[PDB]
Swiss-Prot record:
Keywords: Glycosyltransferase, Secreted, Transferase. It catalyses: [(1->4)-alpha-D-glucosyl](n) + sucrose = [(1->4)-alpha-D-glucosyl](n+1) + D-fructose. The record marks D444 as: Transition state stabilizer. It is an enzyme of class 2 (transferase). Belongs to the glycosyl hydrolase 13 family. Changing E344Q: 30% reduction of activity. This is Amylosucrase. CDD domains: AmyAc_Amylosucrase (cd11324). Amylosucrase favors hydrolysis at low sucrose concentrations, and polymerization at high sucrose concentrations. Competitively inhibited by fructose. GO terms for cellular component: extracellular region. Substrate binds at D144, H187, Q254, R284, H392, D393, R509. Like the recombinant protein expressed in E.coli, the amylosucrase may be secreted in N.polysaccharea without cleavage of a signal sequence. Monomer. It comes from Neisseria polysaccharea.
Amino acid sequence: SPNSQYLKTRILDIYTPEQRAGIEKSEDWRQFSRRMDTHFPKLMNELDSVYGNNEALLPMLEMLLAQAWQSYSQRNSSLKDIDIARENNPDWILSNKQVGGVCYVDLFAGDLKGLKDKIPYFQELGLTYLHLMPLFKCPEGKSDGGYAVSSYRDVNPALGTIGDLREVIAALHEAGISAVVDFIFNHTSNEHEWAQRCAAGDPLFDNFYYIFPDRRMPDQYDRTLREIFPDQHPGGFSQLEDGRWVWTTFNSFQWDLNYSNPWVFRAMAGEMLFLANLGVDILRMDAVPIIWKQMGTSCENLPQAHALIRAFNAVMRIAAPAVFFKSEAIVHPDQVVQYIGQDECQIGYNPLQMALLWNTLATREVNLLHQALTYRHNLPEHTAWVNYVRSHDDIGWTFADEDAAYLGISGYDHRQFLNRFFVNRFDGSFARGVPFQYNPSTGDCRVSGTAAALVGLAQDDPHAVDRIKLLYSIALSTGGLPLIYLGDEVGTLNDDDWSQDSNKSDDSRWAHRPRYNEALYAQRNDPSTAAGQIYQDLRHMIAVRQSNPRFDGGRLVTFNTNNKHIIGYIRNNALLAFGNFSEYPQTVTAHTLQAMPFKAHDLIGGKTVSLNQDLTLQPYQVMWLEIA
């Protein structure tokens, strides 16, 4: 195996002697040389564990690192400043100053120019982090909402140009906001150049995807594969027009990139350096578990998957230190955390907390949430959760059956109830959602619908507004980077007309992907409207979070409230949070509060609260009590 010093001199072997000597004396190279020394041994180890004695490994690595240097040389100087600043502050994502938003560029603002105009609103809201949904060229009609990529360099013409995006990224930075874009690295669309060329049998693109002659292999793989979109096709495979079969985990027009080929790693690392130099602060690592395949396994969460992500990480540490990773692993909780590490993905989605937030609204019982918060919340140093209430996706019930079992809960039966409840097929349910991917062969089902629809705002349930307040508070205060689905802050309901657009009617996730409601946004300043109540509620909690250092970091300790309806937890030995999940008044007992100070200021309601007597929370009330 080669070393850092060998590759460095081989990189400089493209320059003529005259220029080489000048390059070697420059600041850019010194930094690049330092980072090569620190981070290369990780890159080599990671790739070695995946590719072993592969013929192509060294030439690939030489080619990749030659680009890394060129990419870093061309890297805009203000991005280099961010590079140094994040090398020095690896914990910036752990700061209570961070509050994130996410929106579709078109549905929220028309296009990229219009998006840049909404920046003042983002500053009004207090956002420091903004995820723009898939921005790039994709097939017309059905494209899994942009997640089928036809080019990683060409912006969706309907949104604007590559130029506009750089302008947007720059303006966001001027406003103190980080740009977050998807890195859809598991798959491309079937109209992506690499797809067309691989399928056509271009030797330059051999083994870029998994294409089979017949059903022999697909049949054998399917024996152990999870079906993500069963509505679309069974198992993990789609048939071409020519009769062959391609690996398609998601839609049929989404082809799994083949990471057994090292040149696929190189190609995708090149695409990563490109997005980096655009000024992207955080890449959303889409479908992290899917990137490695092995016969007889579920082809999810395999060791090589982790290694490749760690290899990508090292690439950034070398050529773009500012670029952090956000892990999208919507899987078993034991597997979710395994992607979260400083040399893998520094942050990741927290599907466990989100799902249990909703669970608790339905059961009124905090047992699973409290369990999850007690045993699964705290993370390795320099890493954070992305805590959320809703997203562009369905809600999946991703609690651990093992964990449920210790509580005498049957996972199978509990998901039956949760699914019935949130699609308004359980007596008295306040929820107005729709099924997503009901699977007759597994019993599995997920839930589409906005936060407002799922808490009962559509029928004007008197508790709807408080429910939204309650959910966001937990996301904003547990510890980690909170991500608001833009639209929620004014109580945006479903697009009940999703099912009549024929590019959409097979994907109930559009129910909760409506176009910006201008009437609702006009009301955000009026406390008489639900939009206003929700807005000032959220805006208040954001303000408190960002200015009160009791919220800093990601560590939490659960407080046992001795009431099955009330969640309790402590931040930094100075903040005590209570959340009533009952629609009835619920009491935290004086006996329970014995060890707390006799009085504490509530950051929510503004009042001072007595803790040497019984504490009765109103329906869905949340208290943030300063106890130190």
